[PDB]
RNA sequence: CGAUGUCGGCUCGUCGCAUCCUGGGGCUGAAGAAGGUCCCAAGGGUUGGGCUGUUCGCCCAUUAAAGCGGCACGCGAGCUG
RNA sequence: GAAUGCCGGCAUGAGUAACGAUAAAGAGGGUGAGAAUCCCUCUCGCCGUAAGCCCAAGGGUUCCUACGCAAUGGUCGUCAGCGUAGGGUUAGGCGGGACCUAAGGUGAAGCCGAAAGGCGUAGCCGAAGGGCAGCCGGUUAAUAUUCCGGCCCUUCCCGCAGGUGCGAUGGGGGGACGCUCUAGGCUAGGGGGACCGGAGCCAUGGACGAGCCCGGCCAGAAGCGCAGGGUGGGAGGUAGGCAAAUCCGCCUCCCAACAAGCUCUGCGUGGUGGGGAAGCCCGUACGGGUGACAACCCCCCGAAGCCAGGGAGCCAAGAAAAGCCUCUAAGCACAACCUGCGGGAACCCGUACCGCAAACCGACACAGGUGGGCGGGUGCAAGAGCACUCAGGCGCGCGGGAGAACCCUCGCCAAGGAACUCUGCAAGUUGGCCCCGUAACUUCGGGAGAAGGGGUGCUCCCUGGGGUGAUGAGCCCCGGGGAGCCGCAGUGAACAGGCUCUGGCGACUGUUUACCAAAAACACAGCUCUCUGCGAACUCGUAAGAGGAGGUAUAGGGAGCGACGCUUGCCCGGUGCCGGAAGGUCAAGGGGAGGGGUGCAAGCCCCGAACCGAAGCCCCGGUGAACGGCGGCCGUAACUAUAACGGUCCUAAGGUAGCGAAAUUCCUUGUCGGGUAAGUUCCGACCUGCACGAAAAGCGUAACGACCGGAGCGCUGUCUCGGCGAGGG
RNA sequence: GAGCUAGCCCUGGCCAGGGUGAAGCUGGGGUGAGACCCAGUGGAGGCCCGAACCGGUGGGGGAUGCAAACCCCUCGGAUGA
RNA sequence: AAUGUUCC
RNA sequence: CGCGGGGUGGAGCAGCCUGGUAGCUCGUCGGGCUCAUAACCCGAAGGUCGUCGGUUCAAAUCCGGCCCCCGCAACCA
RNA sequence: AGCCUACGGGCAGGCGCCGAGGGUAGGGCCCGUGACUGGGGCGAAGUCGUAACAAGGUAGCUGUACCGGAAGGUGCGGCUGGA
RNA sequence: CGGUGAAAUGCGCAGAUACCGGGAGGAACGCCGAUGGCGAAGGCAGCCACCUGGUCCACCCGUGACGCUGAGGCGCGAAAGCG
């Protein structure tokens, strides 16, 4: 239901804003085990590392329960669906019956006022969380841990999902959003259902400054530089690169694999 | 136009001040040369 | 080469004649008029526009004629760029 | 005797340029040895969103007074921001610290590094941020929210008197937050007034008059009153808030639904206290006295400020900690905490002065630069614009003459109107408001202020709305209609677009070569390729560590292309990249067939072939939005001409669409056509593309452009072709 | 040595006044229900004109300057990158 | 496994 | 006028490097298949190797000199 | 401020609205023309191929899309105007 | 091994074809099936369930001429094509 704009000024015929109807009436955020101060910073102790970050609107870090084995067997009422500037996905405020208030990353189809509970018992309804070994084969799932008791680390962008393709011993086989087939340990928790806000791919930023609002500085091509600064640069006007295409640091950027070969995670990976 | 020197008592005593010298082993050599030469002002005067 | 600023334009000129016009003259396959060619002659004069950065050149409309060159391809301690 | 040698001194230029904004000066009287410059008075001019006033930074005696001019002052100087000397800066309430945290710095524990040192949770430091108790007057030559006067507050400590289980650096609440637009009621500020108070004036023709001129305020506890802002109250049950809790959170019943009630601000009024012009008289640099028993009233406009944590809308989703309230634990409940009233205690630093400038940054009394607040009135539609001007402050620290060329800065011009020229460079035309009216194209928004026009002053009459007001007068906003007057001319001065047609390039707003280039360059949303399954890929670092990211394939890194529309053809032969348990090659090492040196010998020590030996390379495949490349010769048609066609050679494959003398074209001013009297430029075509061409993207594209090219209209000193005048030199 | 300059982090402040009127609401119309169309309201925008502010387009002056980058006219942006 | 000049 | 490559039957290409003998495809001529043409089948002819010279016993072949053709280059102010 | 024969009148004269047309500017429709360019019709014996009519030697036709000197070929789906 | 009219390109001594076992994923639903049915047309085919349209028969129960067609409009509309 993505909002479009009439072309009353240029860069608004294309400018495109996501639908906010799924946000219920909860525009201010919760507190008290909710936001910490989020330190904006483009760089480490000193020099820049990730080039062309900067600017951006000020943000507060909504702290998210990625580890939902804390409260096994304890149900929850979905209080609200809130905006998160830190994420592509939306977030869901949960009032536990136990009394805590935590946020879970809001899956697709979840509505306000729905019971939701984590654990092994944990019936297969959207939002609940289980070990992977107790989830039926072929169900879409998200917020999957990688190793057990380490936190949800897989498939948590907007509209993403992982699909179970089978079991093998203590491990289960996932179809990741990348298409990679990965063996994940059975005790790793995971939250069923897709993430939603799937229309986040269909947004069109419209103009330049909305990238500056998000915190993305302008990006300077290599062939517009001088050869001190980049391999592509230099050349009397518009040279066509004269070399296999590379980074500023020399490593090539068309087809060069750089996964560490001797990695112990290699024998848990089946596909691309 | 705007020239180079835009003074600040806050900046001058923290950049060139005495306690700024002693933190670095470079700045400890700075005073050590100035004691040797005979400067009346080891550090610039901040008031 | 411990520096001689180099094209073109503008302003200012000045000089040479192997003369574009005006003046004089011989021959003419010069009837007259208008020409051709050659000799004497530089005293004066030698237009305004379109195009190009242009010198040059081609055109438009004129004119008695719309000359060629030299003076650091005259002239930037005068200008333009 | 020379080294554009070094240091020092003195010449030449030369009594030459200059004397530092064209905002402007003249006279009288003082003082003085000496006055264009110092002081006083009168007249004139300039600023007045400042060229006036209050802060913060910076500067450190420059502030005031007395004595003085050697030097500084672009002249002089009795003057001074200068020399000598003396004086002057007063705080529980202002600002900062004995309060707090942010970025960052430091850093017990811990990690790392040849040394130096580098990280690092907690803690600590760290401020125009949070928190916190003072307003109005008067005094000095110089200080005042600091002294004094009046009124009002805040901390502690010790007492009493009354209440309650008190009690933490602990739990919770709260502090607590964006942008844009706004409501209601106030205030700051301002305008008017026949009303109130006031010395004075009747000039020059007229006026003793609702005459002129000046002024009608500030602060103020409790209490009221007017606007607001905050928060439901009970009863249970409770597994969370890392021990507990009566508090917070969650669940279930009841009663409110409102601010009715508690509070807390703002604003009026309030015991009372202070101030209080114009003019005249004075003697100061400069202030005083009277006017004054001063009046201290009523309307109107009205904020960007206040009630503040108000409301609404939107996406980019908008600090922390302490103070504050509550709840309880160790301990205590003779303690302690709260309230009220007394008395007592209340430290350290800044406080002068300049502060858009002659006291800061620029070597200078430099036409530059410098953050915040106030910044009046009238008129022009509005306004911080513009012109004049209150308060206030200046005439810019060389002048007097003259009235040549020439230059700068202006003003005007006959007739022509771009003929100037690289080019209308420059200058002129147009310009505000209101109302008619407005094209192709187009992404349906635009283009559009398209273009092109009309009106604009003053007087009188009639008349429609609102606001404050009682439904009324007045005061203030918007209008409408009709008569009439004057000038050459009514945004009568000042501020205030020239327009159109057509190409190239770039989609657009933006950015850059501080200090010769603002562009067709960079960036940009968007498209594609590729990498990266998390202790990610990549970056910084020897490491620890950190960025990525407290992110997880709709995310992140790298590369190219740069909205959008229509599209992105062929070649994997070479280079790169990706896949390939075969094979060939290959190092250390294993292994030792054999051989060598020594010894009388056992022995000791060397070389050392077979064969087993990884990556890489060769080899086999794929891969062009990877690096890249994308043919030559000859003949042929029933007019000639040309070639749909054929032959042949080579390649890995032989430029497809679309475009084309173009930002690519040498020959070239190619050849036609258009514009022009005439067009090496421009526009439209042809294709013989020296040497376009599809993401170093191709062809188009509405809008946009201080880009670049061509044309037309209007208008002009650009020109024919100059002339005259003014001011500064 | 980041007191100039380039970038970023934390915290504060500033942007006079005019225009153009997107979404959304409310009402009417329309339909079987809709889409949608009219008004009125509303005030969005790397929107427009234009001061403070930020720049530096074209010209002229200045060139041992007021100034080791200035002055005058003119011009770009001015709620946003 | 292609083709058959014009009119009659 | 610099550098490199090339001229071969009627057309297009080899053969030159390493001298002794010039070959491939199309075409042309004769004959077959058809009713007739083209395609197809069987035979055959055709080349002063651009010229001029000289090295060798001997030259398309090696080396010089001219004449044409193609490609590259022709820069600095 | 003139003239008139009955003068609180008329004429001459002045002012105003409308006004043919002229000028300026911008639109709409139509006609002629225009380098060059697209396809069409016609034209006794031109060149290239074989598309169709017999299973026209790949059944044909068709809407669409792509490609190719050319008829056409191929894909997807449909028809009998074929077995 | 594929493949044809016959071959060839290709695949395979790195373990192909033919076989068995396991796993992923996509499209279409054999027999039933027909000269069948349904729908206004396009069209519709494994099975289940939900929602829903058209239609036919019997009873002759009720309304009472409410009817037929339909310029425009509106809606559906195979395949190919576009975002
Ligand atoms: Mg808290
Ligand atoms: Mg740090
Ligand atoms: Mg550091
Ligand atoms: Mg870029
Ligand atoms: Mg460059
Ligand atoms: Mg560098
Ligand atoms: Mg390099
Ligand atoms: Mg190039
Ligand atoms: Mg390059
Ligand atoms: Mg020389
Ligand atoms: Mg010399
Ligand atoms: Mg002579
Ligand atoms: Mg003569
Ligand atoms: Mg003669
Ligand atoms: Mg004669
Ligand atoms: Mg003669
Ligand atoms: Mg011209
Ligand atoms: Mg001459
Ligand atoms: Mg010469
Ligand atoms: Mg010449
Ligand atoms: Mg010369
Ligand atoms: Mg010069
Ligand atoms: Mg010159
Ligand atoms: Mg000279
Ligand atoms: Mg000279
Ligand atoms: Mg030039
Ligand atoms: Mg120039
Ligand atoms: Mg000497
Ligand atoms: Mg000597
Ligand atoms: Mg002298
Ligand atoms: Mg003299
Ligand atoms: Mg002289
Ligand atoms: Mg002189
Ligand atoms: Mg002088
Ligand atoms: Mg001066
Ligand atoms: Mg005297
Ligand atoms: Mg004035
Ligand atoms: Mg300060
Ligand atoms: Mg100070
Ligand atoms: Mg100083
Ligand atoms: Mg002093
Ligand atoms: Mg004195
Ligand atoms: Mg003196
Ligand atoms: Mg003395
Ligand atoms: Mg001076
Ligand atoms: Mg002096
Ligand atoms: Mg004196
Ligand atoms: Mg003084
Ligand atoms: Mg003094
Ligand atoms: Mg103390
Ligand atoms: Mg103390
Ligand atoms: Mg503090
Ligand atoms: Mg402290
Ligand atoms: Mg602290
Ligand atoms: Mg910290
Ligand atoms: Mg140590
Ligand atoms: Mg450290
Ligand atoms: Mg503070
Ligand atoms: Mg503060
Ligand atoms: Mg205070
Ligand atoms: Mg003072
Ligand atoms: Mg005071
Ligand atoms: Mg006091
Ligand atoms: Mg307490
Ligand atoms: Mg707390
Ligand atoms: Mg007041
Ligand atoms: Mg008032
Ligand atoms: Mg008044
Ligand atoms: Mg009175
Ligand atoms: Mg009188
Ligand atoms: Mg309650
Ligand atoms: Mg507990
Ligand atoms: Mg209420
Ligand atoms: Mg009061
Ligand atoms: Mg009160
Ligand atoms: Mg008084
Ligand atoms: Mg609010
Ligand atoms: Mg907090
Ligand atoms: Mg603390
Ligand atoms: Mg409270
Ligand atoms: Mg208590
Ligand atoms: Mg003071
Ligand atoms: Mg003071
Ligand atoms: Mg100021
Ligand atoms: Mg100074
Ligand atoms: Mg200087
Ligand atoms: Mg000084
Ligand atoms: Mg001065
Ligand atoms: Mg100054
Ligand atoms: Mg500045
Ligand atoms: Mg400023
Ligand atoms: Mg004001
Ligand atoms: Mg004003
Ligand atoms: Mg007026
Ligand atoms: Mg006004
Ligand atoms: Mg105005
Ligand atoms: Mg103001
Ligand atoms: Mg002004
Ligand atoms: Mg005054
Ligand atoms: Mg002066
Ligand atoms: Mg005049
Ligand atoms: Mg004139
Ligand atoms: Mg005239
Ligand atoms: Mg004219
Ligand atoms: Mg001209
Ligand atoms: Mg000319
Ligand atoms: Mg020209
Ligand atoms: Mg031009
Ligand atoms: Mg101009
Ligand atoms: Mg005018
Ligand atoms: Mg246009
Ligand atoms: Mg419009
Ligand atoms: Mg207009
Ligand atoms: Mg236009
Ligand atoms: Mg008048
Ligand atoms: Mg009012
Ligand atoms: Mg009212
Ligand atoms: Mg008029
Ligand atoms: Mg104007
Ligand atoms: Mg143009
Ligand atoms: Mg244009
Ligand atoms: Mg061009
Ligand atoms: Mg641009
Ligand atoms: Mg384009
Ligand atoms: Mg604009
Ligand atoms: Mg520059
Ligand atoms: Mg420079
Ligand atoms: Mg520039
Ligand atoms: Mg520009
Ligand atoms: Mg694109
Ligand atoms: Mg680092
Ligand atoms: Mg490293
Ligand atoms: Mg990390
Ligand atoms: Mg992070
Ligand atoms: Mg990416
Ligand atoms: Mg990326
Ligand atoms: Mg580009
Ligand atoms: Mg289009
Ligand atoms: Mg391509
Ligand atoms: Mg290739
Ligand atoms: Mg390859
Ligand atoms: Mg290959
Ligand atoms: Mg070995
Ligand atoms: Mg061995
Ligand atoms: Mg190997
Ligand atoms: Mg051929
Ligand atoms: Mg092709
Ligand atoms: Mg061409
Ligand atoms: Mg012509
Ligand atoms: Mg022509
Ligand atoms: Mg053209
Ligand atoms: Mg070319
Ligand atoms: Mg190109
Ligand atoms: Mg390309
Ligand atoms: Mg491009
Ligand atoms: Mg183009
Ligand atoms: Mg264009
Ligand atoms: Mg521009
Ligand atoms: Mg721009
Ligand atoms: Mg012209
Ligand atoms: Mg002139
Ligand atoms: Mg003058
Ligand atoms: Mg800085
Ligand atoms: Mg506005
Ligand atoms: Mg509306
Ligand atoms: Mg607005
Ligand atoms: Mg704007
Ligand atoms: Mg503007
Ligand atoms: Mg301001
Ligand atoms: Mg700049
Ligand atoms: Mg300038
Ligand atoms: Mg403009
Ligand atoms: Mg034929
Ligand atoms: Mg026939
Ligand atoms: Mg050959
Ligand atoms: Mg050959
Ligand atoms: Mg034959
Ligand atoms: Mg035959
Ligand atoms: Mg050179
Ligand atoms: Mg060179
Ligand atoms: Mg050159
Ligand atoms: Mg009568
Ligand atoms: Mg026509
Ligand atoms: Mg056939
Ligand atoms: Mg057929
Ligand atoms: Mg056929
Ligand atoms: Mg095909
Ligand atoms: Mg078919
Ligand atoms: Mg059959
Ligand atoms: Mg019946
Ligand atoms: Mg369809
Ligand atoms: Mg389809």
Residue numbers in the entry:
A (entry chain RD): 2 to 273
B (entry chain R7): 1 to 47
According to the publication:
During protein synthesis, ribosomes select correct aminoacyl-tRNAs (aa-tRNAs) by monitoring the nucleotide (nt) pairing between the anticodon of the tRNA and the codon on the mRNA in the aminoacyl (A) site. Decoding is thought to be governed by a conformational transition in the ribosome—open (off) to closed (on)—that occurs upon codon–anticodon pairing in the A site. Ribosomal ambiguity (ram) mutations increase miscoding and map to disparate regions, consistent with a role for ribosome dynamics in decoding, yet precisely how these mutations act has been unclear. Here, we solved crystal structures of 70S ribosomes harboring 16S ram mutations G299A and G347U in the absence A-site tRNA (A-tRNA) and in the presence of a near-cognate anticodon stem-loop (ASL).
We next solved a 3.7-Å structure of the 70S-G347U ribosome with near-cognate ASLLeu (anticodon: 5′-UAA-3′) paired to UUC. As observed in the analogous 70S-G299A structure, Watson–Crick interactions form between the first and the second positions (U4-A36 and U5-A35) of the codon–anticodon helix but no base pair interactions occur at the wobble position because the distance between the nts is too great. There is a slight widening of h14 coupled with the movement of h8 away from h14 prevents formation of the base triple that normally links helices h14 and h8. Interestingly, the electron density map reveals that the substituted nt (U347) is ejected from its usual position in the loop. This remodeling reduces the h14 loop size to three nts, allowing G346 to form basepair interactions with C342. However, in this 70S-G347U structure, h8 moves away from h14 and thus A160 is too distant to interact. The absence of interactions between h8 and h14 is similar to that observed previously with 70S-G347U ribosomes containing cognate ASLPhe. In other words, both 70S-G347U structures exhibit the reduced h14 loop size, regardless of whether cognate or near-cognate tRNA occupies the A site. Here, we solved X-ray crystal structures of these mutant 70S ribosomes in the absence of an A-site tRNA and in the presence of a near-cognate A-site anticodon stem-loop (ASL). Both mutant ribosomes adopt the closed (on) state when either cognate or near-cognate tRNA occupies the A site.
